[PDB]
């Protein structure tokens with residue numbers, strides 16, 4: 001059944017609750033972002049109102065064929081009324097079009113639902129600064145102190161310099177970047193930019209990127225593989241067998257592949273710095289795992305919460321085991337006691 005952490009008390013609202021059939025008593029279904037665990041269940045046959053960002057709205061229309069009459073896009077950073085309740089959408093610093101939702105309950109309670117987010121100090125100067133938040137529905141994906149990772153900027157720096165050096169040494173080397181969802185576009189766009197190439201990709205993936213309101217996007221991507229030296233492939237094909245196979249398809253235009261796998265976290269983060277990352281190599285193929293996260297590190301999460309000082313925290317990730325739940329509740333208490341709220 002719909003779990004309690006997907007329901008907004010004192011409203012008829014749900015968040016990211018599309019795979020439970022009709023939820024008894026829901027008058028408006030909110031979608032934080034276009035990732036499949038979140039939209040799971042949406043289709044052209046959905047006939048309830050969906051509230052979301054403009055970008056998520058382009059993807060529902062174009063990729064899932066939801067009918068226009070049911071898609072209700074809202075502008076960001078703007079006080080809006082939905083079924084008699086004031087709401088604001090804020091940027092979540094996750095994937096394109098991803099939002100957090102502020103709900104102002106008629107009784108005076110204020111609720112923030114983070115969706116999926118990477119907490120940042122910049123959020124301390126949004127509309128969130130202007131009033132108190134009583135309950136926080138928190139993205140707890142990496143809520144454990146082992147989860148450190150570098151900034152997005154430091155990771156992109158590493159990737160740009162790696163690719164540029166490799167291709168300047170060998171002008172017959174191909175760069176390939178894996179993907180399975182929206183998010184992490186900066187990786188492949190930053191590499192294509194330093195190399196003076198467009199990124200080439202399948203027709204489905206080009207369609208997906210064309211929904212995303214990226215500036216000058218017509219100049220940066222293409223479906224013509226032959227004219228591109230940065231290819232995107234399904235993440236599943238980013239392995240030695242998959243890459244050899246792909247290289248055969250390029251018709252002796254290339255004799256080397258340098259490939260990037262933007263993971264979330266991996267245990268080499270516990271020891272290794274970004275400067276000291278190395279590839280797995282077999283022959284003329286090298287594969288780099290880079291820790292490009294669109295979720296909060298443990299420290300970024302802790303800082304955001306200690307700044308927000310909520311009265312109650314409701315986790316939305318890792319809730320399925322008692323050991324996880326218990327561990328998270330302990331960090332929350334530590335954070336509250338250290339900060340004094």
Ligand code: NI
Pocket residue numbers: 033035094116
């Ligand atoms: Ni997500």
